[PDB]
Amino acid sequence: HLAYSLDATASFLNFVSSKKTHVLETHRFDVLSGGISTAGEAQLVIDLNSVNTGIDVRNGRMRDYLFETATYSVATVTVPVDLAAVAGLAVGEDMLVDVSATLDLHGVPGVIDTQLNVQRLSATRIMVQNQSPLLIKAADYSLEAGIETLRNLASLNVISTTVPVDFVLFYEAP
Numbered sequence: 247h248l249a250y251s252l253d254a255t256a257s258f259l260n261f262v263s264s265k266k267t268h269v270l271e272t273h274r275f276d277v278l279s280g281g282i283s284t285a286g287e288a289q290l291v292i293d294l295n296s297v298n299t300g301i302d303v304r305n306g307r308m309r310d311y312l313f314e315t316a317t318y319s320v321a322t323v324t325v326p327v328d329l330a331a332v333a334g335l336a337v338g339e340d341m342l343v344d345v346s347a348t349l350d351l352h353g354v355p356g357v358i359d360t361q362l363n364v365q366r367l368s369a370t371r372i373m374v375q376n377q378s379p380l381l382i383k384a385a386d387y388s389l390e391a392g393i394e395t396l397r398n399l400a401s402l403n404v405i406s407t408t409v410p411v412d413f414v415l416f417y418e419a420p
C-alpha cells in the first residue's frame with residue numbers, strides 16, 4: 247500500500263567525479279523508481295545499469311568494474327518518513343527532515359545521516375531533495391578497487407574517492 251509513488255520521469259539523481267587536478271564531471275542515473283508506503287517507509291531504487299557519463303565505453307566500465315551490475319543491478323535507499331508531517335505541509339511550504347537513510351550499494355549497507363528538504367507542491371505532489379551538498383566515500387561501499395581499475399584503464403594519475411551526490415525527487419499521492 248503506497249501513500250506516494252515516485253514520478254520517475256521528473257526525478258533525477260546526479261553524482262560528480264573528480265580526476266587529475268580537480269577535473270569535475272557530473273554523471274547521472276537515467277532510471278529511478280520508488281514510493282512511500284502507508285507504513286511510512288520511503289524508498290528510492292537507483293538502476294545502476296542506467297549510469298550515464300556521456301561516453302558509452304566509460305558507462306560500460308562503470309557498470310562492469312565499478313558497480314559490478316551483473317551482481318548488483320540496483321542501489322536501494324530506505325528512509326522512515328512521518329506521513330502526518332508531510333500531510334501537514336501547506337502548499338508551497340517546506341520543512342527540513344533529519345534522516346538516517348539506509349543505502350544498500352555494492353553489497354555494503356550503510357546509514358546516511360543527512361538533512362532533506364521536503365516541499366509540498368500541490369494537494370498530491372511533493373518535492374524531496376538533499377538540503378546540502380552530500381558526499382559519498384567510495385571506501386564506505388567497497389568501491390575503491392573499482393575506482394583503481396578505472397584509473398589504471400585510463401592511465402590516470404588520480405581519481406578522487408569522494409563523490410558529491412545531488413537529487414530532486416518528486417513523489418505523488420493517489
Ligand SMILES: CC(C)=CCC/C(C)=C/CC/C(C)=C/CC/C(C)=C/CC/C(C)=C/CC/C(C)=C/CC/C(C)=C/CC/C(C)=C/COP(=O)(O)OP(=O)(O)O
Nearest residue numbers: 261263265288289290304323325327347384396400409411
Ligand atoms: C518525504 C521523504 C523525506 C521522502 C524520502 C525520499 C528519499 C528515499 C530520498 C533519498 C534520500 C537519500 C539520502 C538518498 C541517498 C542518495 C545516494 C547517496 C545514492 C548513491 C548514488 C551513487 C550510486 C553514487 C556513486 C558513488 C560512487 C562512489 C561513485 C564513483 C564514481 C567515480 C569516481 C567514477 C570515476 C569515473 C572516471 C573519472 C573514469 C575515468 O575514465 P575517463 O574519464 O574515460 O578517463 P580519461 O581521462 O582518459 O578520459
